[PDB]
Amino acid sequence: MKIDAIVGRNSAKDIRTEERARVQLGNVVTAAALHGGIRISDQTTNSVETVVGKGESRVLIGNEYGGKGFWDNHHHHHH
Amino acid sequence: MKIDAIVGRNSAKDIRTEERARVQLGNVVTAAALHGGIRISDQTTNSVETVVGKGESRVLIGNEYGGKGFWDNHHHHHH
Amino acid sequence: MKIDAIVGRNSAKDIRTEERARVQLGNVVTAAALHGGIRISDQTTNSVETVVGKGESRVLIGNEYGGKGFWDNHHHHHH
Amino acid sequence: MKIDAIVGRNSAKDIRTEERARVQLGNVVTAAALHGGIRISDQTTNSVETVVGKGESRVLIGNEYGGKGFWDNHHHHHH
Amino acid sequence: MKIDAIVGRNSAKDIRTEERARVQLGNVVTAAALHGGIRISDQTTNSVETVVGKGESRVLIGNEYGGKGFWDNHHHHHH
């Protein structure tokens, strides 16, 4: 009885944030996720050693669910 | 002690914040993500070792639900 | 470290982010992402040693699921 | 506690990204990817020594499954 | 940095990318997926020393499977 099969695991060893920085640890679920399907056969272990943030740095430990933009905004022209 | 498999669990080993910093431990529910329903899934375990915040740093331990701007966004510029 | 699994797992040794940079570690699931029952088996493992981010750098540790592009709608397009 | 194990498939010794650059490590699964062998499992082991990115550099470490031509490329063959 | 062990597969010693350049390392699998072949084990070994990319450079380390002509080849049919 030491360890068994586990799915999804967000752990951090060290997180440094300064200069009006924000840090959040956990699973993010957008409104879109509501009414649909979460369990999509996942089992990845997320583990970070040391995270250094400078000039308004953002720290996110865990998985994110949503279609409206991947976390933040981003757009441009293609070819 | 403490036995479980595939179950959310927000835990913090140590959190240091200074300079008008804020820290909150728990789940954050947004208006977009319906009202306070509680209990949605909780499978990934969130655990942070040491969190350092400088210059009005924000500390958030746990999962967040909401589609209206991740945490607190309001961008507009397009590149 | 703090893990027994030996297959499929996103881990980072060091991550540096500055200049309004953001770092997210975990599996990304788009709104469309729904298909996917329940199962268990091997998987691709990802491990990064040291990451250096400058000028609004973006750090993503893990797999991403979604049709719309791959992560950032910039280049490439439909046929 | 135990720090003795293999490296994995996708591994990066060092990755440098600057100028609104982004780095994503993991398997990319498109929406098209449905029930039919989605679990590519372990096959090819990719490992990079030192990576340098300048001017909106893009870093992708891992395999891409799904129907969309390709992750990121200029275009088809020319004359 | 501290590693030493003979290993084939896709490996890179150094990769330089700048000027809106993109670098990707891994096996590309189209939606079609590898028909049959219950056994999917690596065979061919590829190793690059140093790659210098200038003015929108593209780096691809690994095998590619899918339609199109450039950056991917396929069988298809003819008339």
From Swiss-Prot, chains A, B, C, D, E:
It comes from the Eukaryota. It is found in: Cytoplasm. Residues 2-73 are annotated as: Prion domain (PrD). [Het-s] is the prion form of het-s. [Het-s] is the result of a conformational change of the cellular het-s protein that becomes self-propagating and infectious. This conformational change generates a form of het-S that assembles into amyloid fibrils. [Het-s] is transmitted as a non-Mendelian cytoplasmic element. On vegetative cell fusion with neutral [Het-s*] strains, the prion spreads throughout the cellular network and converts the non-prion form of het-s to a prion state, making the strains acquire the [het-s] phenotype. Interacts with het-S to trigger incompatibility. Responsible for heterokaryon incompatibility, a process that ensures that during spontaneous, vegetative cell fusion only compatible cells from the same colony survive (non-self-recognition). Forms a prion for the non-Mendelian trait [het-s]. Interacts with het-S from incompatible cells to trigger a lethal reaction that prevents the formation of viable heterokaryons. It is unknown if the native, soluble protein has a cellular function. Homodimer. Forms heterodimers with het-S. The globular domain is dispensable for prion formation and incompatibility function. However, the het-S globular domain, but not the het-s globular domain, is essential for programmed cell death. This is Heterokaryon incompatibility protein s. It comes from Podospora anserina (Pleurage anserina). The gene is het-s.
